[PDB]
């Protein structure tokens, strides 16, 4: 009841999973060498070639 | 028009300009554009030009 920080394993697993998912969704905004990082605008501002 | 070493500048904003009536004109030696398809020019908003 009094002392915390005894359940480290479960908390670490949850933190690792959340970190992996969060960085995966973070990777969505990177330029990756294109001119813009959004599909809709780059489709609505250019021609197919 | 002034000389090349004193090329004239002007700023343009707060307009409603249609480029279709300007694109189709044949009085131009060349009308080539970089990174913007001319036919879609009517469906954009610019901070300034």
Q: Using alpha carbons, select from B10, B9, B42, B8 the residue that is nearest to residue B23.
A: B42
Given an 8 Å threshold on Cβ–Cβ distance, is B35 in contact with A47?
A: no
Given an 8 Å threshold on Cβ–Cβ distance, is B35 in contact with A35?
A: yes
Q: How many angstroms is the resolution?
A: 3.5
Chain B environment of A36 (Cβ under 8 Å): none
Structure obtained using: cryo-EM
Q: Using alpha carbons, select from B46, B36, B48 the residue that is nearest to residue B9.
A: B48
- Is B25 within 8 Å of B19 (Cβ atoms)? no
Which DSSP letter does residue A29 get?
Answer: G
Query: In Å, what is the CA distance from A45 to each residue of A31, A32, B9?
Result: 16, 18, 26
Q: Which helix (H) or strand (E) holds A20?
A: helix A8-26
- Is B44 within 8 Å of A45 (Cβ atoms)? yes
Query: In Å, what is the CA distance from A22 to each residue of A17, A35, A37?
Result: 9, 24, 18
- Is A37 within 8 Å of A29 (Cβ atoms)? yes
Which DSSP letter does residue B41 get?
Answer: G
Sign of the alpha-carbon torsion through A16, A19, A25, A29: negative
């Amino acid at each position: 009841s009094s002392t915390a920080s005894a359940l480290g394993k479960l908390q670490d697993v949850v933190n690792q999973n959340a970190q992996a998912l969060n960085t995966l969704v973070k990777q969505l905004s990177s330029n990756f060498g294109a001119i813009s990082s959004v599909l809709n605008d780059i489709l609505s501002r250019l021609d197919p070639p | 028009f002034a000389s090349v070493y004193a090329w004239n500048r002007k700023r343009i904003s707060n307009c409603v300009a249609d480029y279709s009536v300007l694109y189709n004109s044949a009085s131009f030696s060349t009308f080539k554009c970089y990174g913007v398809s001319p036919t879609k020019l009517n469906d954009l908003c610019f901070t300034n030009v």
